[PDB]
Write an enzyme that holds these catalytic residues in place. Structure first.
Site, PDB file in Angstrom:
ATOM      1  N   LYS A   1       0.847  -1.191   0.000  1.00 32.19           N
ATOM      2  CA  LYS A   1       0.000   0.000   0.000  1.00 32.19           C
ATOM      3  C   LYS A   1       0.881   1.239   0.000  1.00 32.19           C
ATOM      4  CE  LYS A   1      -1.511   2.951   3.540  1.00 32.19           C
ATOM      5  NZ  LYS A   1      -1.810   4.029   2.530  1.00 32.19           N
TER       6      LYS A   1
ATOM      7  N   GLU B   1      10.681   0.778  10.025  1.00 29.71           N
ATOM      8  CA  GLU B   1      11.696   1.733   9.573  1.00 29.71           C
ATOM      9  C   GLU B   1      11.219   3.123   9.991  1.00 29.71           C
ATOM     10  OE1 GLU B   1      14.625   2.043   8.236  1.00 29.71           O
ATOM     11  OE2 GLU B   1      15.158  -0.084   8.019  1.00 29.71           O
TER      12      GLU B   1
ATOM     13  N   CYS C   1      13.722  11.299   6.926  1.00 22.40           N
ATOM     14  CA  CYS C   1      13.973  10.868   8.293  1.00 22.40           C
ATOM     15  C   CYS C   1      15.461  10.718   8.584  1.00 22.40           C
ATOM     16  CB  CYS C   1      13.245   9.553   8.569  1.00 22.40           C
ATOM     17  SG  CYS C   1      13.808   8.183   7.529  1.00 22.40           S
TER      18      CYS C   1
ATOM     19  N   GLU D   1      10.438  15.688  15.557  1.00 21.92           N
ATOM     20  CA  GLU D   1      10.891  15.696  14.172  1.00 21.92           C
ATOM     21  C   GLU D   1      10.204  16.817  13.396  1.00 21.92           C
ATOM     22  OE1 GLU D   1      10.259  11.987  12.067  1.00 21.92           O
ATOM     23  OE2 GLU D   1      12.327  12.114  11.339  1.00 21.92           O
TER      24      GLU D   1
HETATM   25  N1  LIG Z   1      11.750   4.620   8.860  1.00 22.01           N
HETATM   26  C1  LIG Z   1      12.027   5.117   7.533  1.00 22.01           C
HETATM   27  O1  LIG Z   1      12.908   4.631   6.850  1.00 22.01           O
HETATM   28  C2  LIG Z   1      11.161   6.294   7.009  1.00 22.01           C
HETATM   29  C3  LIG Z   1      11.330   6.792   5.739  1.00 22.01           C
HETATM   30  C4  LIG Z   1      10.534   7.837   5.315  1.00 22.01           C
HETATM   31  C5  LIG Z   1       9.567   8.377   6.165  1.00 22.01           C
HETATM   32  N2  LIG Z   1       9.403   7.872   7.428  1.00 22.01           N
HETATM   33  C6  LIG Z   1       8.419   8.412   8.325  1.00 22.01           C
HETATM   34  O2  LIG Z   1       7.080   8.799   7.523  1.00 22.01           O
HETATM   35  C7  LIG Z   1       6.476   9.685   8.271  1.00 22.01           C
HETATM   36  C8  LIG Z   1       5.757  10.702   7.372  1.00 22.01           C
HETATM   37  O3  LIG Z   1       4.550  10.122   6.899  1.00 22.01           O
HETATM   38  P1  LIG Z   1       3.288  10.151   7.870  1.00 22.01           P
HETATM   39  O4  LIG Z   1       3.414  11.334   8.816  1.00 22.01           O
HETATM   40  O5  LIG Z   1       2.021  10.291   7.049  1.00 22.01           O
HETATM   41  O6  LIG Z   1       3.237   8.791   8.725  1.00 22.01           O
HETATM   42  P2  LIG Z   1       2.199   7.595   8.460  1.00 22.01           P
HETATM   43  O7  LIG Z   1       2.684   6.340   9.157  1.00 22.01           O
HETATM   44  O8  LIG Z   1       0.841   7.981   9.007  1.00 22.01           O
HETATM   45  O9  LIG Z   1       2.078   7.328   6.859  1.00 22.01           O
HETATM   46  C9  LIG Z   1       2.820   6.260   6.270  1.00 22.01           C
HETATM   47  C10 LIG Z   1       1.900   5.030   5.992  1.00 22.01           C
HETATM   48  O10 LIG Z   1       1.365   4.623   7.100  1.00 22.01           O
HETATM   49  C11 LIG Z   1      -0.054   3.967   6.698  1.00 22.01           C
HETATM   50  N3  LIG Z   1      -0.906   4.070   7.828  1.00 22.01           N
HETATM   51  C12 LIG Z   1      -1.318   5.184   8.472  1.00 22.01           C
HETATM   52  N4  LIG Z   1      -2.105   4.798   9.508  1.00 22.01           N
HETATM   53  C13 LIG Z   1      -2.169   3.440   9.503  1.00 22.01           C
HETATM   54  C14 LIG Z   1      -2.820   2.532  10.322  1.00 22.01           C
HETATM   55  N5  LIG Z   1      -3.640   2.858  11.451  1.00 22.01           N
HETATM   56  N6  LIG Z   1      -2.702   1.219  10.079  1.00 22.01           N
HETATM   57  C15 LIG Z   1      -1.945   0.779   9.033  1.00 22.01           C
HETATM   58  N7  LIG Z   1      -1.307   1.665   8.225  1.00 22.01           N
HETATM   59  C16 LIG Z   1      -1.423   2.996   8.471  1.00 22.01           C
HETATM   60  C17 LIG Z   1      -0.486   4.589   5.650  1.00 22.01           C
HETATM   61  O11 LIG Z   1      -0.943   3.613   4.606  1.00 22.01           O
HETATM   62  C18 LIG Z   1       0.719   5.399   5.097  1.00 22.01           C
HETATM   63  O12 LIG Z   1       0.995   5.041   3.819  1.00 22.01           O
HETATM   64  C19 LIG Z   1       7.580  10.375   9.067  1.00 22.01           C
HETATM   65  O13 LIG Z   1       7.254  10.446  10.375  1.00 22.01           O
HETATM   66  C20 LIG Z   1       8.848   9.501   8.869  1.00 22.01           C
HETATM   67  O14 LIG Z   1       9.477   9.205  10.177  1.00 22.01           O
HETATM   68  C21 LIG Z   1      10.191   6.829   7.857  1.00 22.01           C
HETATM   69  C1  LIG Z   2      15.220   9.494   4.729  1.00 16.96           C
HETATM   70  S1  LIG Z   2      15.235   8.318   3.332  1.00 16.96           S
HETATM   71  O1  LIG Z   2      15.625   6.866   3.894  1.00 16.96           O
HETATM   72  O2  LIG Z   2      13.754   8.239   2.723  1.00 16.96           O
HETATM   73  C2  LIG Z   2      16.407   8.879   2.125  1.00 16.96           C
HETATM   74  C3  LIG Z   2      16.119   8.800   0.745  1.00 16.96           C
HETATM   75  C4  LIG Z   2      17.057   9.253  -0.205  1.00 16.96           C
HETATM   76  C5  LIG Z   2      18.302   9.779   0.212  1.00 16.96           C
HETATM   77  C6  LIG Z   2      19.275  10.243  -0.707  1.00 16.96           C
HETATM   78  N1  LIG Z   2      19.697  11.517  -0.733  1.00 16.96           N
HETATM   79  N2  LIG Z   2      20.590  11.663  -1.660  1.00 16.96           N
HETATM   80  C7  LIG Z   2      21.193  12.859  -1.916  1.00 16.96           C
HETATM   81  C8  LIG Z   2      21.840  13.103  -3.147  1.00 16.96           C
HETATM   82  C9  LIG Z   2      22.459  14.346  -3.393  1.00 16.96           C
HETATM   83  C10 LIG Z   2      22.442  15.358  -2.410  1.00 16.96           C
HETATM   84  C11 LIG Z   2      23.013  16.507  -2.633  1.00 16.96           C
HETATM   85  N3  LIG Z   2      23.517  17.519  -2.829  1.00 16.96           N
HETATM   86  C12 LIG Z   2      21.799  15.118  -1.178  1.00 16.96           C
HETATM   87  C13 LIG Z   2      21.181  13.877  -0.936  1.00 16.96           C
HETATM   88  C14 LIG Z   2      20.800  10.481  -2.280  1.00 16.96           C
HETATM   89  C15 LIG Z   2      19.970   9.524  -1.697  1.00 16.96           C
HETATM   90  C16 LIG Z   2      19.871   8.144  -2.039  1.00 16.96           C
HETATM   91  O3  LIG Z   2      19.081   7.444  -1.365  1.00 16.96           O
HETATM   92  N4  LIG Z   2      20.609   7.585  -3.053  1.00 16.96           N
HETATM   93  C17 LIG Z   2      20.646   6.280  -3.505  1.00 16.96           C
HETATM   94  C18 LIG Z   2      21.590   5.976  -4.514  1.00 16.96           C
HETATM   95  C19 LIG Z   2      21.704   4.671  -5.035  1.00 16.96           C
HETATM   96  C20 LIG Z   2      20.880   3.640  -4.553  1.00 16.96           C
HETATM   97  C21 LIG Z   2      19.936   3.914  -3.548  1.00 16.96           C
HETATM   98  F1  LIG Z   2      19.168   2.959  -3.096  1.00 16.96           F
HETATM   99  C22 LIG Z   2      19.827   5.218  -3.033  1.00 16.96           C
HETATM  100  C23 LIG Z   2      18.578   9.858   1.593  1.00 16.96           C
HETATM  101  C24 LIG Z   2      17.643   9.412   2.542  1.00 16.96           C
END
Ligand SMILES: NC(=O)c1ccc[n+]([C@@H]2O[C@H](COP(=O)([O-])OP(=O)(O)OC[C@H]3O[C@@H](n4cnc5c(N)ncnc54)[C@H](O)[C@@H]3O)[C@@H](O)[C@H]2O)c1
Ligand SMILES: CS(=O)(=O)c1ccc(-c2nn(-c3ccc(C#N)cc3)cc2C(=O)Nc2cccc(F)c2)cc1
Lengths: 492, 492, 492, 492
Positions: free
Chosen positions: D184, D260, D294, D391
């Protein structure tokens, strides 16, 4: 701790099939004390006929269904751990024998050599029941897996500069994988290895699993190299004898080969380093074990801005290096191993001045009550001079100059050898760049001679073929067998 | 699929630095079709001078800061993946080239040899950015890690029985680890490898990374083996030449050596096996690729209960085998590679008759042109006969009878060779006991012969040194550098 | 050996920071001997306040620069090996404590339970300095490596059916990786775990590295599961409590969770099996440890051709099984753990007779003292019965009947559980097909309860989360940290 | 490259069994352009009924004997290789979708986001036939090996900040190991994932292997997390919702959980670092992807001596940051994702001003339409302030002052989060001390937001459970099955 006083040398015979046996020819050969020159004892001299008996005994203990083959892998480790306990119990006697035979200061034979021996047996005792093969997701309706089997009878040849330590470094991974061993210590220092024979028998090792054959190189060693019944040879020694070892394998039965050959390994001090620390480490890096190391610093590249006071601090401490008798707790450096090594070291010291090197202190001038040589510091050395290209194996420290980082990487790498290398600095970029650019098996950063049972060790280029120590030292002593089973239908 | 009609041989020159060159001497050597004996074309003959130009080009492509050294490991895999796409596009041309040059039936070259080439390149394309070192928890205040770096310039020498497949087996793991390559295909079959050079340039490999030098053994091959600027040699071929390679490596520059030498592989058939299935699989075990496989199940051991029926079934199957033109889709068996092999097979067949073996069918040449040999089956073969101890790279099946599992285990292991073995049985205890007891690098259970890109392939004893294919094939082409950093505190 | 007579229970207090302490509330709880039904001693009852003290002590022992964190990994192992030496020293004492507290026959406790305890500590003593991270060849000018660090404070909750072995299986990999432990033994069997704290103290573990807190589930256990200062919980027990465990983790700390839950494991016997061997193996598969193994083969599927004969031998062996006092050397089966377990078994035995199942022997209790239950065998069991769907932790052996292979694979896999399975056959094809088709973490072929210090466990579907034992048990107690260092150029 | 002209959104339906379906209720939900607030399109809204149809399709595709389970592991990788080719062919269209629907600058989507998508699919394409089990040398007459099988149906829930990249990070390791997927995407950004459904079909994945269900959290997401027929859930990544995921998994069917979650990651700038370089990388570490990573980045600790100059240079860079339309090639920063995030950031900016922090720059919204926010820099931030915790998923930089390394390590680690950390210094001792002391799954040295397909990525503490990327990402999507076979003899 104290060196055990009136040390009898109880074990001087050949160790085959857990039994002490005389030489087939009847000959014996003398063992010498390098700190005086007096003969210590005489040891049975193994020749080809004695090697043939040791190989037949090792082959029998390795046959299918034998005690050593059927033994649980974990019990292989328990035996190695019990060998470490027996060595720890006789640590004083073994260290005393190592000072007597090899001329090492007793207090560092106790605290350095014997520690590495104990830790090596303990480390590889844990590996025995953790040597894993793999299962492979292969194409088609098949089930494929591998087994890491022991190779078989292993011939092992070791030098004289670390007799007990190299003995442990060779048999511990070999027995850990389940092999049987015919090992020939250096003719100069066979005593500690022979004492290990009694400990091996006391530990409970089956007869024929380890066979210790003291003798000379071209006789007993060459018999090991060309023997058709030895599956694998592990040689640690000079490059030229290593070339002969490799030729003998291809000529005979194409036995698997690994060669630890050492070389002229560089030592790179940069301006960023702490001079008080870099001086002492580059000093120990070349002077330790009476300079008879291949990791030995020999070359010491120092940056432009610190070259003068580095030499100033080197000769300062190089003149306080307490030379003396190994049984004295004040002794830092003992004597060289024998006269020939005590001779050709001084040819090269004379070669240093003969090519123009500011011999600071050093040059040799100790009372010949033994094989002792005065700690020597050369400077203004260049890559041209002969003392920069061939290894010394003596307390001779050669200091060089360099300006650019790019020039010191080419100068350090321009060498057909390449066992180790060191860099002293606090800049992370220059520490990572130089370490990644070295053509060497081990690179030390802000330290020297830091060996551990856990870390692999070996040489690049002609110094040479193979890796020892760590986990990767076990791959040298194992044979991969692949089993592929046809199955009715594959899933997952 | 059909053979390429008017197959012109477009690439007949030496391949150095991604450019087609004439030989330094100007000589060329002929290439023949083994099915008709006619000359197909002429190819520039590389000798010592051409090898020297290839080594300096391979060394330059490997120097620090070059494209091939700076390139991302994943981009090395992208190039191997692109190479497999080009081989797939020209799959019919290469299969026709293998059929015309090597005598393999076209359908077998298309569905077996070419499939193995494509899957090999695709397999090692994925390994390039997954070759990992380790970080090690050593004693004291140290941070120890290891890198797996390329060896350097790798010399590679391959035989004629699987020209294209052996080509991929050698260069794919070498390029995967980042080395550069000087490879010499067999003088009998250089055409597939030369065509790969054009695909290597089309795929975008940097110049000098792969250099292909067609020529003879004593000239081109021996120059590769004795070159002092080559870091590693990988040889697949006869055991007699393999001895000369390991020898010449030691007396030259102590280069690392990989040997794949094959042997006299047993095939054990128990009475509790699918008899019709075992007859067919053991028939393919000897007769596939005109009997010119090192994995050839030369000695087929059959339990006495089913010996007569197995012989009768194998003889009928051999009498049905279709020998003919490789381009004919009906053909099962092509010709032998040359007159040298043809004569050595006919002489061995004479030796089997003279020593008492029962010639059940065949035993003579077929036709007047080419090198076709009748499918031959020997029964009543004993362990002491010459045909039982010597390798017959030809369509000659040898059937021996046995009684007990322990008897056939000792007889199957009684060999200087140990490349491959197989057991056919439905009993899990017999299957596991025999496969664990075989002194061979690959053991097949109820199959013959499942090779794959994922499974390590090698030999025990004099059948080879080291492994190819799978992850373990990568270890032959990497060298381990250990880096140890002194750190302030260390917190485990 | 003999049970140590008139055994004195000396350790009955809470073990925190290597100090014996009383309950913060002052409460105590009684421990009973299930062979005679009366009270052995009284043990301090830990609650939320006591867990809080344990967590604080474990957090301090894990802080940076502490003795436990600064300790060499190899020294962590020698502490684990010293612990195994001590357990071996007091082996008869701990076995007597396990017979007295758990009702296990003393010789079974001596030769099985404690043999696994000693081997477990020795096995993980060797893994401590061999936990390797990795260096990765990432894209770009970067140097990337990984550190496998301990997670931190680990909460551990264990059941009563293998108290000492459970204790070892939990703390051995946790300490091997460098964690600190707060462990809560089952309220029925806290004695041998508390004695371990005395051996922990004698071995020399730093204070607070291991904290042992005896108490009840919904109090001491729930406080552990919901504690915000605990990084990871490891639970072994019932499926229902395991659901409470993961809920508490998500509701509070997001702590890492691994679960080891129920089994209802099938045992499949084919007609070609050795019926004498299979009858006894499947008999121990149900009856061992008084039927209180999660790995109990309570669903014995027997091929049709051998069913009624298998039932007869299974019946004869059951009536022959000696039930009596655990201290008696002739005793094979002891009593159940307590009154609650004693009642649930009979209520399920009566469930089987109220339905179609045929009761062949036993079926009732033995007397008054202790909770002894007659060895019980049910025939003609079908999948619909409650007796075939619910876990019977008792000496109740159910024998089902099957015809085809595809049928018994379907029936065995039809379960929310899936911890373990076994197959008895001499045919390699159905052995490999069935073992691959099973939905269980461990499949035994021609054996049963053959667990080892190596080799993982459990643990499929709703029977577990993660794995213990082997190398993979270490993966549950480490956290990966990737470190990427920007470098000037990067080559190789 | 330029944005795709006009661009039609062709795929707006639910993707199940390789077919486009309407929602079971007939409802659709709008998708908006965050740069203008205008509605882009409408998408079928999946709910509990559609999840059940997807789980059924995923379960059938995972059935034993199906195409997806019988397929060679290498052919699973071939499909991932083809998907990467299709994504590369349509790189501009998907980049335009990410820019239009997600607000990212087009050139950032094209060169950063889609480069990561392509490399991810290619990396895991190579891992498919390289997932290895192990053979284990256990005690006794046993042969023990492990198989790593797919877990089964994997539910996956991803966020909106990196839609396409999160999609690849989820399905690539799951498909590489042989699972089936019900994913999803976030309700804000479902367009890129739905387009991938077309490429998944074109690539040739069997039906039901990947199912994409656009919908909301409490409806479609909560049905996935509580589904009884789903074997594993992987979630990303709000910490509050992450607690509901782990709780619902324990309450439903004890499915395996990978989280994550969020982070407040520190960036430590020491005085002996390149200032101009550290200011730019710390700027990108905060402001990249509109500050919606994040891996931010927010808390920048600066050594006292360079604090004010670092602050001035950071403000100077922030005042120059170009904010505007994502399609304009000059834009460095697009809008925030939606009004809820927009208001959340403005609220926290007020909290920083009210709590005493120095608003050096920014602090307001830009324009009347879209969700653009001025690049904002706070100085004089302290740990207790609300903005120092909590955050801020926005373009807000916070700069804190420190001296002494021991202080900044205690303050950077003072957090319930622990996803990421960075340190800028040229001293190798400071860099190694800090990185080893950080409680974070990823530590960068002299760089920020590196990230590659080869290096595992995850969080310490409440920042996540488990690891993604690299080889260790595969460990989350495999079940270890141990098989132990009793053998007659057993030898090494
Ligand atoms: N851990 C990582 O690698 C990572 C990467 C990117 C973003 N994030 C987090 O994403 C967040 C931003 O998105 P957000 O604020 O909308 O959070 P969010 O959890 O509400 O949204 C993400 C997903 O959670 C699902 N979701 C929401 N409520 C749910 C429920 N009760 N049951 C099952 N699924 C549910 C939704 O389908 C949505 O796609 C940030 O807080 C960030 O920390 C984490
Ligand atoms: C929080 S997160 O986990 O959603 C996330 C997502 C993407 C990046 C990101 N950021 N950058 C980036 C690039 C240029 C500049 C500048 N100037 C700053 C940042 C590059 C990446 C990246 O993921 N690359 C990558 C490359 C190959 C394979 C793969 F799988 C991922 C960082 C965190």
């Amino acid at each position: 701790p104290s060196p055990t006083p009136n040390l009898e040398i109880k074990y001087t015979k050949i160790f085959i099939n857990n039994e002490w046996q005389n030489s087939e020819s009847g000959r014996v050969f003398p063992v010498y004390n390098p700190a005086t020159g007096e003969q210590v004892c005489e040891v049975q001299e193994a020749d080809k006929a004695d090697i043939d008996k040791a190989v037949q005994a090792a082959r029998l203990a390795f046959s299918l269904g034998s005690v050593w083959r059927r033994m649980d892998a974990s019990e292989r480790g328990r035996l190695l751990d019990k060998l470490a306990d027996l060595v720890e119990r006789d640590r004083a006697v073994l260290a005393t024998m190592e000072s007597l035979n090899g001329g090492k200061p007793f207090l560092q034979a106790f605290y350095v050599d014997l520690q590495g021996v104990i830790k090596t047996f303990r480390y590889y005792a844990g590996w025995a029941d953790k040597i894993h093969g793999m299962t492979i997701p292969v194409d088609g309706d098949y089930f494929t897996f591998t087994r890491h089997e022991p190779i078989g009878v292993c011939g092992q040849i070791i030098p004289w500069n670390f007799p007990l330590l190299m003995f442990a470094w060779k048999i511990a991974p070999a027995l850990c994988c389940g092999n049987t061993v015919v090992i020939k210590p250096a003719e100069q220092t066979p005593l500690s290895a022979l004492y290990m024979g009694a400990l091996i028998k006391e530990a409970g090792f089956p007869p024929g699993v380890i066979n210790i054959l003291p003798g000379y190189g071209p006789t007993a060693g060459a018999a090991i190299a060309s023997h058709i019944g030895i599956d694998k040879i592990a040689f640690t020694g000079s490059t030229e004898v290593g070339k002969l070892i490799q030729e003998a394998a291809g000529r005979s039965n194409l036995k698997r080969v690994t060669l630890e050959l050492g070389g002229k390994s560089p030592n790179i001090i940069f301006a960023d380093a702490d001079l008080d620390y870099a001086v002492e480490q580059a000093h120990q890096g070349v002077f330790f074990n009476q300079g008879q190391c291949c990791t030995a610093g020999s070359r010491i590249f120092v940056e432009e801005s610190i070259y003068e006071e580095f030499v100033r601090r080197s000769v300062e401490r190089a003149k306080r290096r307490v030379v003396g008798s190994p049984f004295d707790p004040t002794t830092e450096q003992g004597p060289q191993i024998d006269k020939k090594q005590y001779n050709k070291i001084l040819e090269l010291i004379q070669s240093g001045v003969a090519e123009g090197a500011k011999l600071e202190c050093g040059g040799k001038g100790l009372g010949r009550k033994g094989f002792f040589i005065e700690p020597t510091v050369f400077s203004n050395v260049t890559d041209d001079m002969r003392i920069a290209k061939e290894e010394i194996f003596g307390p001779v420290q050669e200091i060089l100059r360099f300006k650019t980082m790019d020039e010191v990487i080419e100068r350090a790498n321009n060498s057909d050898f390449g066992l180790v290398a060191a860099v002293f600095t606090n800049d992370i970029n220059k520490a990572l760049t130089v370490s990644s650019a070295m053509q060497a098996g081990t690179v030390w950063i802000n330290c020297y001679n830091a060996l551990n049972a856990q870390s692999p060790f070996g040489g690049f280029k002609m110094s040479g073929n193979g890796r020892e120590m760590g986990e990767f030292g076990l791959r040298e002593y194992s044979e991969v067998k692949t089993v592929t089973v046809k199955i009715p239908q594959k899933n997952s």
